[PDB]
């Protein structure tokens, strides 16, 4: 049936990211330079991250031992390995297969991919490097937050205090209303489409690295006998699969907000806000949207309304979905706990 | 949350039931809660029991409407003679607090940093000491060893998740890096309260053979470690059976 996007949508999206970034005044990431001042550190990090898997274990299987070897040597010969890598990214476009096994939760199941140790070592280095350079240059804004500074319950907290301590939401004097959305992005990765990626990454990173990624996804995937090329979606088990993912969701967000309102939340590049901030109360009140917060998939939004605007909406919607039944309160859903 | 407390009671009963059938018995008289709750040292399983409690039971019908507030309790688990047992929830400080304490502590540290700057001195470690454990990032981190390195770690949370995808076993605390976050809870006190609340060392041992080994002197006993056989035997080609 061909790819789903259609060129139309594609072009609109790309242009979006563009005006954003220009507006955001963003310098793309360079290829990791051979002469690097921090480099050994970063490599220390990534390698400890792999090491940690095996810290606890008492019996090591084959693949494992293979790994620990590759690590230990990587500690030993840092200049060697770094050269090895920078080579690999500059060139290699074809990769070993990957292996799925499902793990049980007695309710749900989850896939667990497994890469192959060399490919791992590169990745982990590049993952580490990306997050570092990015957060260094403030790519991702406030509102994208499964982030560093806040353990999750703390996130909940600051989110309430945000809700509240912003101006005026509690005055029901008139008909005034305010509304939260809770959503998922459904399939999000499983629709990520490469040729579009490889562009969107040409934006933010050197055409090499990007290529290393997009090409890093297509693999065979072997469960026992069954095996198939991965032509289309995104494989999450990849050490850097995090990054991309956040990135791609940003694109979703710049839609849901639309340019301006985002530029409220971020403020200038020079003065990015903290999580919930603005300049004047008006900056809150220039729009119905006050808070927007997005955590991996789930999106959370907070609208502030007056009978005017609100009833103009319910004018639109109602106009197109008339129910003299008054049965729109059937499928509608709220909590069974409370 | 009612149903969760319900699940606690069940689950824990189910585990004890495991160790029980591990012999052959569900008989309650054989397993007084000493058996399960004495710390490993005294020769118990040391399992940390927050089943017990008493569980608010009020009149479901209306509690589908009003939130009628607790009017009654239903006995969670039991005993034969009772005593009681301390439960975890009581030894762990709740979030609101720790966020508040964090707030103040980090304020204090703001000032004392401004002084030690103004006076061009380096910190007392005492001026900071009382607050050592307080604070959400847990002041201790400031002085952790490898900091110069850990400046270059970024996005540890995400990684701590997406590990879901990349490997088999859990690491049930994903939500924290003890490096970045400090360490968010301590227990020990529990050990002591469970020890005494069982009636003290001198009763607990009345259940054992400790007066059959002829030792009249207690605390001098460390147990011993059955470390050796596994290294010797495990690796050697034992039949799977």
């Amino acid at each position: 049936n061909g790819p789903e996007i259609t060129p139309e949508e594609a072009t609109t999206i790309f242009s979006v990211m563009v005006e954003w970034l220009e507006s955001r005044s963003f310098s793309p990431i360079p290829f990791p330079p051979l002469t690097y001042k921090n480099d050994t550190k970063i490599l220390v990090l990534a390698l400890e991250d792999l090491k940690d898997v095996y810290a606890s274990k008492v019996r090591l299987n084959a693949s494992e031992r293979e790994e620990l070897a590759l690590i230990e040597e990587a500690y030993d010969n840092p200049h060697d390995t770094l050269n090895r890598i920078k080579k690999y990214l500059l060139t290699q476009r074809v990769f070993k297969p990957v292996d799925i096994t499902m793990m049980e939760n007695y309710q749900n199941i989850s896939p667990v991919y497994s890469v192959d140790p060399l490919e791992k070592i590169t990745d982990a280095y590049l993952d580490q490097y990306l997050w570092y350079e990015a957060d260094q240059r403030k790519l991702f804004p406030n509102w994208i937050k499964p982030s560093d500074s806040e353990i999750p319950p703390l996130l909940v907290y600051k989110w309430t205090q945000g809700i509240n301590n912003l101006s005026e939401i509690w005055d029901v004097s008139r008909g005034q209303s305010a509304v939260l959305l809770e959503t998922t992005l459904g399939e999000m990765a499983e629709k990520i489409d490469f040729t579009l990626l490889n562009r969107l990454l040409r934006l933010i990173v050197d055409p090499n690295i990007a290529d290393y990624i997009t090409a890093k996804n297509n693999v065979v995937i072997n469960f026992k006998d069954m095996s198939h090329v991965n032509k289309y979606g995104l494989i999450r088990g990849l050490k850097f699969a995090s990054f991309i993912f956040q990135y791609y969701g940003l694109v979703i967000d710049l839609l849901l907000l639309g340019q301006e309102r985002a530029t409220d939340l971020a403020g200038p590049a020079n003065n990015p806000n903290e999580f919930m901030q603005f300049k004047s109360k008006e900056v809150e009140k220039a729009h119905p949207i006050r808070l927007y917060t997005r955590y991996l998939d789930r999106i959370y939004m907070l609208f502030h309304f007056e009978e005017d605007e609100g009833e103009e909406l319910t004018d639109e919607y109602l106009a197109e979905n008339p129910d003299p039944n008054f049965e729109n309160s059937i499928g509608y859903n709220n909590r069974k706990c409370w | 949350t009612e149903p969760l407390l319900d699940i606690l009671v069940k689950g824990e009963t189910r585990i004890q039931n495991r160790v029980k059938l591990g012999l052959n018995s569900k008989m309650p008289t054989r397993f007084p809660p000493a058996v399960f709750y004495t710390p490993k040292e005294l020769g118990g399983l040391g399992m940390i029991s927050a089943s017990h409690i008493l569980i608010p039971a009020s009149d479901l019908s209306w509690s589908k409407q009003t939130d009628t507030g607790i009017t009654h309790f239903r006995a969670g688990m039991t005993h034969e003679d009772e005593k009681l047992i301390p439960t975890i929830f009581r030894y762990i400080t709740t979030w609101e607090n720790e966020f508040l304490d964090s707030q103040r502590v980090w304020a204090e540290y703001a000032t004392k940093r401004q002084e030690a700057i103004q006076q061009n001195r380096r910190l007392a470690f005492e001026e900071l000491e009382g607050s050592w454990d307080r604070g959400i990032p847990r002041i201790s981190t400031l002085f952790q060893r490898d900091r110069h390195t850990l400046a270059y770690d970024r996005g540890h949370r995400i990684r701590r998740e997406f590990k879901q995808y990349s490997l088999e076993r859990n690491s049930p605390f994903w939500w924290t890096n003890s490096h970045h976050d400090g360490k968010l809870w301590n227990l020990n006190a529990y050990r002591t309260d469970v020890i005494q609340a069982l009636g003290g060392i001198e009763t607990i041992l009345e259940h054992t053979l400790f007066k059959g080994t002829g030792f009249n002197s207690w605390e001098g006993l460390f147990w011993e470690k059955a470390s050796g056989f596994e290294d010797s035997m495990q690796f050697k080609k034992l039949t799977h059976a």
Partner: peptide
């Protein structure tokens, strides 16, 4: 400029939400 230890302490302070923009290194 801050130095490896110095970037770290400031980072933790910011993480608390303590730091106002005033005090960041840059």
């Amino acid at each position: 400029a801050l130095t490896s230890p110095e970037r770290w302490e400031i980072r933790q302070l910011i993480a608390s939400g303590a730091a106002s923009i005033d005090d960041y290194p840059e």
